[PDB]
Curated annotation (Swiss-Prot), chain B:
SMART domains hit by this protein: Adenylsucc_synt
Involved pathway(s): Purine metabolism; AMP biosynthesis via de novo pathway; AMP from IMP: step 1/2
Gene: purA
Lineage, broadest ranks: Bacteria, Bacillati, Bacillota, Bacilli, Bacillales
Record function comment: Plays an important role in the de novo pathway of purine nucleotide biosynthesis. Catalyzes the first committed step in the biosynthesis of AMP from IMP.
EC number: 6.3.4.4
Entry's Gene Ontology cellular component terms: cytoplasm
Top-level taxon: Bacteria
Subunit structure: Homodimer.
Protein name: Adenylosuccinate synthetase
HAMAP family on file: Adenylosucc_synth
């Protein structure tokens, strides 16, 4: 490229914004694609070359042999899950020579999965509704500075020593705090060290990889997981994930300076959803909510568990604009709102009679926020083949325009269906 | 826009304060973004010395907004002690803003820090014993209490009860020791919160309002790159991100909102705590550096570890923190050493590398590969520019720049404001 070209794709809501197909789309012209936080709690389905894939840890660019795909230091990586994903790709003829895994990423082990389950049980009605993938406990071990990293996993002596130290504490935790069974040093070592040996070929300093690309004008794309409202700092704490999905997470999570990001695409669904527990001011429980859930396919891919759905919440997206420095808006799933005569967009919260434009930091106060909404007329046309704003039925265009007006973010892309070819470009985010 | 971050490139003892104090003069907002009261330096303002820890260095200018961002862990007791300290000395703090999303350090965090350290035996981290790590662990666990919670009497009481039930069982079962009653903590700390409440707000709004209105913002780093939880000498690190990237997550600003990152390094290296330190000195030269550089705990008088300048570390920092320029401090400390050394690479298994290894075992075995330079004997504490230096001092400074690949912006030859000079 002419000059530095670096784009971050972030979810502006509580995950499931449709970031996956937007990253897939932007991947087409990127040279490097990088994850920067989270673990296998992430995921999106892609049908590539007529074959269905669901990636959880591996970045979107993997399907293109010539694009470098980076798992940054900011992630928590379950080696077993990573190898299952690699095998799935390989069995379908996808090479993964282009994968790069940070030597400083943290490693999720079986005790993290059990700790996740036990912590959730202990919280009773205050449970977070985590993905049960050990994410929280791995990030806790990182902060505790007892966590095991990829560099350690590759070292026969170091991995054994850290397991011995860690299991000494964790087994006492399980046995004495939770009255349950723990794990075995030797069994975890033998199984997971072998996983490490299969991953070793990809392990390197990924900050060097990304900065070499950035400094030499290669197009770099950063792929966010979860979304701003699940951010450990800026989301609906404690009903959040234990990492930073905001664009800022790219800097700490890959080792790049903050000025090395040129554009931040905030991906918003035309309505909102939550998978786990916690406040959700615009949540719906009516026939419209059911229609949105059904048409939007808002169910767990694996479990079929219904997600919570609600009207678009512009308070949340204006919050995301600020804390994540959003420069560009991608509005997805507009087709899901087809056939609903009156649509609503939440423009403010009412909190004990007081109308506010902020997400309160105090959960008890946020839990009291009632949505204050504008109503907009809907449309009946099938818009799943539409190619431009001009082509949209008047009311659908007005709805799209109103989202950009209310959020203060210029529209750069919109999507009218779940497929990659249903993404329409309004503005180029690469220069 | 003007939005500058001052970051330490070593292990937190780089003389960041000299640079922050100078740059604060023309900033309109000064913001901390990570860490807690495990920070601070002596500020000279109007000729008067002040020592702070949590409060940003711009507090003395009534017209400058000072922000404690969401990324910090805040001991309310310690914060109030600092507030009273300033008020007793005639300094107003109306300009302080405290994030409603910053996490709160409570007495059980301090005990937990001590217990964890004991449990690690010879592998202890050598923490500052201020409860920093345990507070960041509770954050990741999502059980941590934030400033907004502290201000809510019933919610604070409920979270204290929940957390103490867990922590007390933790201390009993894991550490064979007693914990705390709710009574021991509740009223005392709730009252601290009530005295801080006047400052509590959305600090992301404060910072973005300033940025979007072309006000100059200065972000004040604590610790240094080699103590970074991700990029430092893990696990011998602090539990936050001192790198420039930490400002984004730690204050809620987008990455492209930072325009300049000033890396600060000393002309030699130092560590306060435990862990690898490839260029560490255990000889007469080491003592001279510690003595002249006054490298001792400000409160305990505990000596710090010192060593030669390490350019591998600073090149690492250049990359992971996106350094735009470099300030080189305490050059005067190297006076009177006949042969100076700068580490340009590491030797491990006789293999020469230009990287900081992620693997602790490899790092612990890295031997420094050094270039040797002739020293000087003259007093350089009075110079205002590089061309006033003795030849060998100027050459030393030039080589640091050449080896790190970073342009020099400032240098210092003393503790005073007039001993920090532009390049
Ligand atoms: N890929 C995802 N999509 C939507 N929500 C998620 C995702 N990953 C985590 N979460 C949510 O983040 C919170 C914490 O889960 P975990 O990240 O497993 O600790 C819960 O509310 C989850 O439902
Ligand atoms: N202000 C500081 N200056 C130098 N080293 C520090 C500072 N704060 C923390 N550290 C180091 O960071 C590590 C973790 O300490 P803590 O931040 O208390 O968890 C130890 O090596 C400390 O010596």
């Amino acid at each position: 490229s002419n000059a530095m070209s670096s784009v971050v794709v972030v979810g502006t809501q509580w995950g499931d914004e449709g970031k996956g197909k937007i990253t897939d789309f932007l991947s087409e012209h990127a040279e490097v694609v990088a994850r920067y936080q989270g673990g296998n709690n992430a995921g999106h389905t892609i049908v590539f070359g007529g074959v269905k894939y669901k990636l959880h840890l591996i970045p979107s660019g993997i399907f293109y042999k010539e694009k470098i795909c980076v798992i940054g230091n900011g992630l928590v990586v379950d080696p077993k899950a990573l190898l299952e994903e690699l095998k799935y790709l390989h069995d379908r003829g996808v090479s993964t020579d282009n994968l790069r895994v940070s030597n400083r990423a943290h490693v999720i082990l079986p005790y993290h999965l059990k700790q996740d389950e036990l912590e959730e049980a202990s919280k009773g009605d205050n449970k977070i509704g985590t993905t049960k993938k050990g994410i929280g406990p791995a990030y806790m071990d990182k902060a505790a500075r007892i966590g095991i990293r990829m560099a350690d996993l590759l070292d026969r002596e170091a991995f054994k020593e850290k397991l011995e130290q860690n299991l000494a504490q964790k087994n006492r935790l399980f046995e004495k705090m939770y009255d349950t069974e723990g794990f075995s040093v030797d069994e975890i070592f033998e199984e997971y060290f072998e996983y490490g040996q299969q991953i070793a070929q990809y392990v390197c300093d990924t900050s060097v990889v990304l900065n070499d690309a950035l400094d030499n004008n290669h197009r770099v794309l950063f792929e966010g997981a979860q979304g701003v409202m699940l951010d450990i700092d800026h989301g609906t704490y404690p009903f959040v994930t234990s990492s930073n999905p905001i664009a800022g997470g790219v800097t700490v999570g890959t080792g790049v300076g903050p000025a090395k990001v040129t554009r931040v695409v905030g991906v918003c669904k035309a309505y909102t959803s939550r998978v786990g527990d916690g406040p959700f001011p615009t949540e719906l429980h009516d026939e419209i909510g059911h229609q949105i859930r059904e048409v939007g396919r808002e169910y767990g891919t694996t479990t079929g568990r219904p997600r919570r759905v609600g009207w678009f919440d512009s308070v949340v997206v204006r919050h995301a604009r600020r804390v994540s420095g959003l420069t560009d808006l991608s509005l997805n799933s507009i087709d899901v709102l087809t056939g609903i005569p009156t649509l609503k967009i939440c423009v403010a919260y009412k909190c004990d009679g007081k109308v506010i434009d902020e997400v309160p930091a105090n959960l008890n106060i946020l839990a009291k926020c009632e949505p204050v909404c504008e109503e907009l007329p809907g449309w009946t046309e099938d818009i799943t083949g539409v190619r431009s704003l001009d082509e949209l039925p008047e009311n659908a265009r007005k709805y799209v325009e109103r989202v950009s007006e209310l959020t203060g973010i210029q529209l750069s892309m919109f999507s009218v269906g779940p497929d990659r070819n249903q993404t329409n470009i309004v503005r180029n985010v690469y220069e």
